């Protein structure tokens, strides 16, 4: 819920 690509963002 607006989540899990946003940890595929923390690796960037």
Curated annotation (Swiss-Prot):
Signal sequence residues: none
Superkingdom of the source species: Eukaryota
Name this polypeptide is given: CASP8 and FADD-like apoptosis regulator subunit p43
Organism: Homo sapiens
Lineage of the organism: Eukaryota, Metazoa, Chordata, Craniata, Vertebrata
């Amino acid at each position: 819920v607006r989540r899990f690509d946003l940890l595929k963002r923390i690796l960037k």
